[PDB]
């Protein structure tokens, strides 16, 4: 039995086989329901006269929103609920601690129309 050649003065850890798991029991026993869905990301609209002006003029909608959301989820959620292509979405956190989403739609839609469709103005 002879030796082996070596070109480097280094020894490094061999690249053994990195196994993957074979669990004998699933961890938590339930696939947790979707923590975040449309009905959770959108709490309600917003009522103030400023919002009324924005919906009247800019073809914009103003929703109160979960602080765990983002614009991707909001766009998807509004598409789901109200069937309204939203163009852009802008957000802030109101100092009473809650997310506020302005939502600019597209000219195929009228925010006032869908607002009275919802029921509120």
């Amino acid at each position: 039995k002879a030796l082996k050649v070596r070109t480097s003065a280094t020894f490094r850890l061999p690249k053994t086989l990195k196994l993957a798991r074979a669990p004998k029991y699933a961890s938590k026993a339930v696939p947790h329901y979707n923590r975040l869905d449309s009905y959770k990301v959108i709490e309600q609209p917003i009522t103030s006269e400023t919002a009324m002006k924005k919906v009247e003029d800019g073809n914009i909608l103003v929703f109160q929103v979960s602080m765990k959301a983002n614009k991707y989820q909001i766009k998807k959620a509004v598409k789901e609920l109200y069937e309204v292509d939203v163009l852009k979405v802008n957000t802030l956190v109101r100092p009473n601690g809650t997310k506020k989403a302005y939502v600019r739609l597209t000219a195929d839609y009228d925010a006032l129309d869908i607002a009275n469709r919802i029921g509120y103005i």
């Binding site: 030796l3 082996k4 050649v5 070109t7 003065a9 280094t10 020894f11």
Partner: protein, 233 residues
């Protein structure tokens, strides 16, 4: 052919770059490897006392081979054939009321250190095999003198792995024979003649002789340099 050309490069000191020569001697090994090697080194470098290194006198592989052949003949039974023997004898003592004697007597080998040592203390043993390669040497260093005192032959064989494989284990470090059939008892007799000639006839002088103390290549070379240049006439 006419396009190809012999370039050859100058791999001298400052001329060019060096190639991937082999450097296994210059490797940074891990520490278990270093510990292995340096431990063996220190063991030979220190003036070993004599009971150690009347170890280090393993058998010639030929005699070893014949001993292993014999012991393979006298091997024990594996658990499967043991269980089927047991089914046989269970039916036999259930039908004929045999006293566990319908099953014959065994003639086989006796692994186990406590066992073997009691066998020597009672002098039941005809032969013992002792592995050189045991980690706590304290388990075995006394056995030569013990076998010499009870007057039975011992063989410092090579490979506790080999004995474990002999008796269906990983390692055993030791084995022994106490009851042999006449089919190869004379083979055993000339064998143990060789064994006592190699071990129990030289026990005294190897017990006198301190071993080890062997140096490295480099140190040996400088020592003999000193030797030649000193005794040069």
């Amino acid at each position: 052919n006419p396009l190809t050309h012999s370039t050859p490069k100058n791999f001298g000191i400052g001329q060019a770059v060096q190639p991937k020569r082999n450097l296994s001697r210059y490797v940074k090994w891990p520490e278990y490897v270093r510990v292995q090697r340096q431990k063996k080194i220190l063991s030979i470098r220190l003036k070993v006392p004599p009971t150690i290194a009347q170890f280090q006198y393993t058998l010639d592989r030929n005699t070893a081979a014949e001993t292993f052949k014999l012991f393979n003949k006298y091997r024990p039974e594996t658990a499967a054939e043991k269980k089927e023997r047991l089914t046989k004898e269970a039916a036999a003592v259930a039908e004929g009321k045999s006293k566990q004697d319908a099953s014959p007597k065994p003639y086989a080998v006796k692994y186990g250190l406590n066992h073997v040592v009691a066998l020597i203390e009672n002098k039941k043993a005809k032969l013992v095999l002792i592995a050189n390669d045991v980690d706590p040497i304290e388990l075995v260093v006394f056995l030569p003198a013990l076998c010499k005192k009870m007057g039975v032959p011992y063989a410092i064989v090579k490979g506790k792995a080999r004995l474990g494989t002999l008796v269906n284990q990983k390692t055993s470090a030791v084995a022994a024979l106490t009851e042999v059939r006449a089919e190869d008892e004379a083979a055993l007799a000339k064998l143990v003649s060789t064994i006592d000639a190699n071990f129990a006839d030289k026990y005294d002088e190897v017990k006198k002789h301190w071993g080890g103390g062997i140096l490295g290549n480099k140190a040996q070379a400088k020592m003999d340099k000193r030797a030649k240049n000193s005794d040069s006439a």
